[PDB]
Subunit: 120 residues, 6 copies
């Protein structure tokens, strides 16, 4: 159970989002071992009047929010962060200074999945 | 008691139901959490086909509900909220429980500003 | 240190003020949290009328401000942040504090990846 | 479920009453948390005069009660427990509520090993 | 580099004869599961008088409570693995039923712990 | 606002210093956390040599200071508290900072009962 929400400038995000989704899924499969069937991504292509970022970021700026169960080690979480940075760099040439990632951890019992609370 | 709901789904599916979905979720919250019937705070996010990826074993009725609320309720009450929403949405709209995902985010009251004041006040 | 702001409101009311509102909110974070004046990260979500339900005692000026930030600040600093935002948006726009809601989401530094590394490094 | 109580007080005041304080505390948890009446887990820590410093406004009847339990109970319930302990200890022992201090530590279930297994199992 | 403090509570008459060997067993478990340095043993023992120790009737006088204070950051699986290894090793060495053993993990953010003159996150 | 201190050390070494160490610790809490000078709550646990194991790069002066307090202070203030304790104790007693260990246990105010009522009230 991992949800990704990806935000970026529409003009830049729309051309890459289909391959970006594949890349982020690969990266979760590899580092966290989710099932390949369980891709849950949402994209928010933003109008330029709706997205403010500092002058040392380009229009390629991506914010990647990952919502996930509590319980993974700090080391796994850090590896996930570095792997996403490396893979988006490799695939698209977007600088690490233009990528931001935030992990939101949720206790299992706070998540309803397939009709039941996540801890059941 | 302050509760925000955010709901996401494929625009095609969500837009025809959202008015009635809102009523059903709000009733759910009145009955399980005993919130004030006046206090409905909902935001809907209809998504373009190309912006919404859900599992390949599931369908385009995939519906995501995020609820943001004050800390302090029991685990039993929260579990009963999840089971009520799953039940009422399945029955009202014929959306399978495998196509519903619900996530609760609890916020300490001092972290929320409401009507000019922090929530613990 | 990293502060991300997400602001929601009715499109008709939010669209004409959002640029200025961005300025005012950033000023408030500079003053209360002493973040770098360079480090403005804001996203706006102007909503269709049909996608936004709020109570009868809010008007159509209702703004929800979600602030995502590193844990580690005191309760008194965070409360001060909430009050400064209420005061500044009210003084600048005449939007009543009853129409303004602020929620703080605190995240451990190590859960945040910035410039290629985890926030605690 | 699992509730551990630890009680600390001056030896000369605690030792005469600890058998009965143990019964009072357990009745309170039975009534308020609805734990099984079999499941009493109590430890007492009678302290030497020179090992216990408390404020001058307080008397040598000062008792500290630490309760370790599973996370998952409502704030209303935890507050009912606090109120119940104060009242019953005051009534039974003539110890003033100013001379009683109670702290609760909540532990997630998966962090507690009980009868050979993790608590969430 | 990991700080792990263990606090161990049992009936004095039962705990006193075994505490020395129990300290070794518990350390070995932490080294094997958490991979702490073998020179970083921090244990406190609280042998209790009979009248200071109540437990249910389905626990015997061998009842042992092990409180483990440690840094946040380990996975749930590693933590459960620590619980199961402690259960098993204490039973195997001393003949104490796993039913007589209780363990509680207390996780502390690193910045809330001062070690060797500095905050643990430094 | 409320702070409890528990101090563990080898009885031979702790007993002769405890009374002055209490003064030194309370001074540090007054100065860094601004607690009331009246509100000293300290428990000492002089341990037998067979009940205290520590590594061979700690001496028999090894002190474990457990501090239980309200949540809500900044990381910067808690770190100052740690630094001040290290300094004052090394200065006053000639114990190396390498022999001093401090652990802060933060508790929601609503998880504490004081003078009959929850700490958030």
């Amino acid at each position: 159970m991992v949800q990704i929400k990806v935000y970026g400038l529409a003009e830049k995000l729309n051309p890459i989002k289909a391959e970006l989704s594949n890349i982020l899924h690969t990266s979760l499969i590899e580092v966290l071992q989710i099932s390949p069937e369980k891709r849950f991504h949402r994209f928010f292509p933003l109008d330029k009047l709706d997205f403010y970022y500092p002058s040392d970021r380009t229009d390629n700026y991506l914010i990647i929010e990952i919502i996930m169960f509590e319980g993974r080690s700090v080391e796994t979480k850090k590896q996930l962060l570095r792997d996403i940075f490396k893979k988006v760099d490799e695939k698209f040439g977007i600088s690490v200074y233009d990528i931001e990632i935030t992990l939101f951890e949720i206790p299992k019992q706070n998540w309803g999945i397939r009709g039941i609370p996540g801890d059941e």
